[PDB]
Short mmCIF file of C-alpha atoms in Angstrom, two decimals:
data_model
loop_
_atom_site.label_atom_id
_atom_site.label_comp_id
_atom_site.label_asym_id
_atom_site.label_seq_id
_atom_site.Cartn_x
_atom_site.Cartn_y
_atom_site.Cartn_z
CA UNK N 1 2.19 -4.67 -15.90
CA UNK N 2 0.64 -3.70 -12.56
CA UNK N 3 1.41 -2.84 -8.92
CA UNK N 4 0.05 -6.15 -7.60
CA UNK N 5 1.81 -8.05 -10.37
CA UNK N 6 5.01 -6.48 -9.02
CA UNK N 7 4.11 -7.61 -5.50
CA UNK N 8 3.57 -11.15 -6.75
CA UNK N 9 6.94 -11.01 -8.55
CA UNK N 10 8.77 -9.64 -5.52
CA UNK N 11 7.00 -12.42 -3.64
CA UNK N 12 8.44 -14.95 -6.07
CA UNK N 13 12.00 -13.62 -5.81
CA UNK N 14 11.53 -13.89 -2.04
CA UNK N 15 11.89 -10.22 -1.11
CA UNK N 16 9.45 -10.89 1.74
CA UNK N 17 10.61 -7.84 3.67
CA UNK N 18 9.63 -5.62 0.71
CA UNK N 19 6.33 -7.39 0.02
CA UNK N 20 5.34 -6.84 3.64
CA UNK N 21 5.97 -3.10 3.88
CA UNK N 22 4.50 -2.48 0.42
CA UNK N 23 1.42 -4.71 0.68
CA UNK N 24 0.82 -3.15 4.09
CA UNK N 25 0.90 0.33 2.59
CA UNK N 26 -1.19 -0.90 -0.34
CA UNK N 27 -3.75 -2.30 2.10
CA UNK N 28 -3.89 1.00 3.98
CA UNK N 29 -4.41 2.77 0.67
CA UNK N 30 -7.09 0.25 -0.30
CA UNK N 31 -9.19 0.85 2.83
CA UNK N 32 -9.10 4.54 1.99
CA UNK N 33 -9.62 4.24 -1.75
CA UNK N 34 -11.94 1.32 -2.36
CA UNK N 35 -12.00 0.21 -5.99
CA UNK N 36 -8.41 1.26 -6.48
CA UNK N 37 -8.28 -2.52 -6.56
CA UNK N 38 -10.73 -5.13 -7.79
CA UNK N 39 -12.08 -7.81 -5.42
CA UNK N 40 -9.82 -10.44 -6.99
CA UNK N 41 -6.94 -8.02 -6.51
CA UNK N 42 -7.81 -7.47 -2.85
CA UNK N 43 -7.73 -11.22 -2.26
CA UNK N 44 -4.28 -11.39 -3.89
CA UNK N 45 -3.08 -8.51 -1.76
CA UNK N 46 -4.25 -10.15 1.45
CA UNK N 47 -2.67 -13.48 0.61
CA UNK N 48 0.64 -11.91 -0.37
CA UNK N 49 0.58 -9.87 2.81
CA UNK N 50 -0.32 -12.80 5.04
CA UNK N 51 2.33 -15.00 3.41
CA UNK N 52 4.67 -12.15 4.14
CA UNK N 53 3.55 -11.96 7.78
CA UNK N 54 3.96 -15.73 7.95
CA UNK N 55 7.52 -15.90 6.68
CA UNK N 56 8.30 -13.16 9.21
CA UNK N 57 6.86 -15.57 11.78
CA UNK N 58 4.15 -13.29 13.13
CA UNK N 59 1.50 -15.95 13.13
CA UNK N 60 -1.42 -14.25 14.84
CA UNK N 61 -1.27 -11.40 12.34
CA UNK N 62 -1.00 -13.87 9.49
CA UNK N 63 -4.01 -15.70 10.89
CA UNK N 64 -6.25 -12.66 10.76
CA UNK N 65 -5.13 -11.72 7.25
CA UNK N 66 -5.61 -15.27 6.03
CA UNK N 67 -9.14 -15.44 7.48
CA UNK N 68 -9.82 -12.04 5.94
CA UNK N 69 -8.59 -13.39 2.63
CA UNK N 70 -10.92 -16.39 2.81
CA UNK N 71 -13.84 -14.08 3.47
CA UNK N 72 -12.95 -12.20 0.30
CA UNK N 73 -12.70 -15.50 -1.57
CA UNK N 74 -16.32 -16.25 -0.65
CA UNK N 75 -17.42 -13.27 -2.74
CA UNK N 76 -17.35 -13.66 -6.53
CA UNK N 77 -4.17 -18.53 -11.28
CA UNK N 78 -5.09 -16.65 -8.12
CA UNK N 79 -3.80 -18.15 -4.88
CA UNK N 80 -5.68 -21.38 -4.28
CA UNK N 81 -8.20 -21.39 -1.47
CA UNK N 82 -6.70 -24.74 -0.53
CA UNK N 83 -3.18 -23.27 -0.38
CA UNK N 84 -4.42 -20.57 1.99
CA UNK N 85 -6.25 -22.97 4.27
CA UNK N 86 -3.10 -25.06 4.51
CA UNK N 87 -0.98 -22.15 5.73
CA UNK N 88 -3.80 -21.01 7.97
CA UNK N 89 -3.69 -24.49 9.50
CA UNK N 90 0.05 -24.08 9.94
CA UNK N 91 -0.32 -20.80 11.78
CA UNK N 92 -2.87 -22.31 14.15
CA UNK N 93 -0.55 -25.25 14.78
CA UNK N 94 2.40 -23.12 15.80
CA UNK N 95 0.01 -21.13 17.98
CA UNK N 96 -1.04 -24.41 19.58
CA UNK N 97 -4.62 -24.08 18.39
CA UNK N 98 -5.04 -27.57 16.93
CA UNK N 99 -8.81 -27.54 17.28
CA UNK N 100 -8.69 -24.68 14.76
CA UNK N 101 -6.05 -26.13 12.49
CA UNK N 102 -8.01 -29.34 12.30
CA UNK N 103 -11.24 -27.47 11.61
CA UNK N 104 -10.03 -25.59 8.53
CA UNK N 105 -8.45 -28.63 6.97
CA UNK N 106 -11.28 -30.98 7.82
CA UNK N 107 -13.60 -28.49 6.15
CA UNK N 108 -11.90 -29.25 2.85
CA UNK N 109 -13.85 -31.87 0.90
CA UNK N 110 -11.95 -35.15 1.23
CA UNK N 111 -11.55 -35.55 -2.53
CA UNK N 112 -9.93 -32.10 -2.71
CA UNK N 113 -7.31 -32.71 -0.02
CA UNK N 114 -3.67 -32.82 -1.16
CA UNK N 115 -0.98 -35.20 0.08
CA UNK N 116 0.58 -32.32 1.99
CA UNK N 117 -2.77 -31.49 3.58
CA UNK N 118 -3.25 -35.11 4.59
CA UNK N 119 0.14 -35.26 6.27
CA UNK N 120 -0.68 -32.27 8.43
CA UNK N 121 -4.07 -33.68 9.43
CA UNK N 122 -2.50 -37.04 10.20
CA UNK N 123 -0.02 -35.33 12.51
CA UNK N 124 -2.77 -33.29 14.16
CA UNK N 125 -4.60 -36.48 15.03
CA UNK N 126 -2.17 -37.15 17.89
CA UNK O 1 8.32 2.59 8.35
CA UNK O 2 8.65 2.30 4.57
CA UNK O 3 10.91 5.22 3.70
CA UNK O 4 13.19 4.31 6.60
CA UNK O 5 13.41 0.80 5.17
CA UNK O 6 14.48 1.94 1.72
CA UNK O 7 17.16 4.01 3.48
CA UNK O 8 18.58 0.96 5.25
CA UNK O 9 18.78 -1.10 2.06
CA UNK O 10 20.58 1.75 0.33
CA UNK O 11 23.07 2.10 3.17
CA UNK O 12 23.44 -1.68 3.12
CA UNK O 13 24.44 -1.27 -0.53
CA UNK O 14 21.48 -3.37 -1.71
CA UNK O 15 20.98 -1.16 -4.76
CA UNK O 16 19.39 -3.28 -7.47
CA UNK O 17 17.09 -3.96 -4.55
CA UNK O 18 15.99 -0.40 -3.73
CA UNK O 19 15.55 0.49 -7.40
CA UNK O 20 12.56 -1.78 -7.88
CA UNK O 21 10.91 -0.69 -4.64
CA UNK O 22 11.63 3.05 -4.70
CA UNK O 23 10.39 3.03 -8.28
CA UNK O 24 7.01 1.54 -7.37
CA UNK O 25 6.79 3.88 -4.40
CA UNK O 26 7.51 6.88 -6.60
CA UNK O 27 4.75 6.03 -9.07
CA UNK O 28 2.39 5.45 -6.14
CA UNK O 29 3.35 8.75 -4.55
CA UNK O 30 2.74 10.60 -7.81
CA UNK O 31 -0.79 9.20 -7.92
CA UNK O 32 -1.39 9.99 -4.25
CA UNK O 33 0.29 13.38 -3.92
CA UNK O 34 -0.91 13.32 -0.33
CA UNK O 35 0.33 9.83 0.49
CA UNK O 36 3.82 11.05 1.38
CA UNK O 37 5.25 14.09 3.13
CA UNK O 38 7.15 16.53 0.96
CA UNK O 39 10.21 15.56 3.04
CA UNK O 40 9.61 11.87 2.36
CA UNK O 41 9.09 12.48 -1.33
CA UNK O 42 12.52 14.10 -1.33
CA UNK O 43 14.08 11.05 0.29
CA UNK O 44 12.45 8.71 -2.21
CA UNK O 45 13.74 10.67 -5.16
CA UNK O 46 17.27 10.84 -3.82
CA UNK O 47 17.35 7.15 -2.95
CA UNK O 48 15.98 6.19 -6.36
CA UNK O 49 18.47 8.39 -8.19
CA UNK O 50 21.28 6.70 -6.27
CA UNK O 51 20.15 3.31 -7.51
CA UNK O 52 19.91 4.72 -11.03
CA UNK O 53 23.48 5.85 -10.37
CA UNK O 54 24.77 2.47 -9.15
CA UNK O 55 23.23 0.89 -12.18
CA UNK O 56 24.95 3.27 -14.57
CA UNK O 57 21.99 5.24 -15.89
CA UNK O 58 23.37 8.73 -15.58
CA UNK O 59 20.94 10.71 -17.72
CA UNK O 60 18.12 9.16 -15.70
CA UNK O 61 19.87 9.83 -12.41
CA UNK O 62 20.33 13.44 -13.48
CA UNK O 63 16.57 13.77 -13.90
CA UNK O 64 15.73 12.31 -10.52
CA UNK O 65 18.45 14.30 -8.80
CA UNK O 66 17.18 17.56 -10.27
CA UNK O 67 13.60 16.74 -9.27
CA UNK O 68 14.95 16.11 -5.77
CA UNK O 69 16.62 19.52 -5.47
CA UNK O 70 13.59 21.06 -7.17
CA UNK O 71 11.58 19.57 -4.31
CA UNK O 72 13.96 20.36 -1.46
CA UNK O 73 13.21 23.99 -2.31
CA UNK O 74 9.58 23.74 -1.28
CA UNK O 75 10.85 22.91 2.20
CA UNK O 76 16.52 12.53 8.48
CA UNK O 77 17.17 13.90 4.98
CA UNK O 78 20.23 13.50 2.74
CA UNK O 79 22.49 16.55 2.47
CA UNK O 80 21.52 18.89 -0.36
CA UNK O 81 25.26 19.38 -0.86
CA UNK O 82 25.78 15.63 -1.24
CA UNK O 83 23.07 15.44 -3.87
CA UNK O 84 24.61 18.31 -5.81
CA UNK O 85 27.87 16.39 -5.69
CA UNK O 86 26.41 13.15 -7.04
CA UNK O 87 24.63 15.29 -9.60
CA UNK O 88 27.94 16.76 -10.70
CA UNK O 89 29.36 13.25 -10.84
CA UNK O 90 26.70 12.33 -13.38
CA UNK O 91 27.31 15.38 -15.51
CA UNK O 92 31.01 14.62 -15.38
CA UNK O 93 30.74 11.02 -16.55
CA UNK O 94 28.33 12.24 -19.23
CA UNK O 95 30.93 14.84 -20.17
CA UNK O 96 28.49 17.71 -19.63
CA UNK O 97 31.26 19.72 -17.98
CA UNK O 98 29.38 23.02 -18.17
CA UNK O 99 26.50 21.51 -16.22
CA UNK O 100 28.79 19.88 -13.68
CA UNK O 101 30.65 23.12 -13.12
CA UNK O 102 27.44 25.13 -12.84
CA UNK O 103 25.97 23.01 -10.09
CA UNK O 104 29.13 22.91 -8.03
CA UNK O 105 29.97 26.55 -8.61
CA UNK O 106 26.49 27.30 -7.27
CA UNK O 107 27.49 26.08 -3.81
CA UNK O 108 28.75 28.82 -1.50
CA UNK O 109 32.53 28.51 -1.22
CA UNK O 110 32.32 28.39 2.58
CA UNK O 111 30.35 25.15 2.22
CA UNK O 112 32.46 23.38 -0.40
CA UNK O 113 33.98 20.10 0.81
CA UNK O 114 37.40 18.82 -0.30
CA UNK O 115 35.66 16.37 -2.66
CA UNK O 116 33.78 19.21 -4.31
CA UNK O 117 36.84 21.44 -4.61
CA UNK O 118 38.68 18.60 -6.31
CA UNK O 119 35.95 17.87 -8.83
CA UNK O 120 35.92 21.59 -9.67
CA UNK O 121 39.71 21.73 -9.98
CA UNK O 122 39.65 18.72 -12.29
CA UNK O 123 36.85 20.26 -14.35
CA UNK O 124 38.86 23.47 -14.70
CA UNK O 125 41.66 21.83 -16.71
#
């Protein structure tokens, strides 16, 4: 297996605390040793970390990581872009930035929107 | 930070927990010999060995414990005397009496706690 695999596992088992401190350290290490991780791996790392930040309820931090993740995604069973946007939207909502929550969701092609994503939108339109 | 966190989980008694983490941290440290302070490396090792000890992997604990002491010689931190104790506990369970005795005997008498004196006494029968 692999270090990031282990972070995804720990993520699964819900050791959020651990994922946070480790992914954080991993990220620090990544900015100092580029190509210790592959671009797909970096995306994974960012999502796991942001998810972590999110569960810990530090939304502004999560927001920046999420948007960083999406940037990475632009470059070319990984976390779905659509899953990330959803949580991003959630962060914005709690932060009372609905303009921004709406934007990210609305930017998802209508045919690609999930029931969950449509609920959120619906609520936002109020 | 990180090392501090592992400490807290250990204290909390969340052992099967710290094993996974400390393990991954150890392998990382090894690959980035400059990622962690010598003092922090020591902590890691000790904490990992303890988890290896809660899970009952004594031979493996012995290894980590001895690497710990081996490191603490290059030099907050867990008592070197407490490590030596746990180390002797492993040898004992493993029935390596000679090795248990040696490590305890090697502690200056002035510094030997009741626990240690008892283990020794037991081992001397």
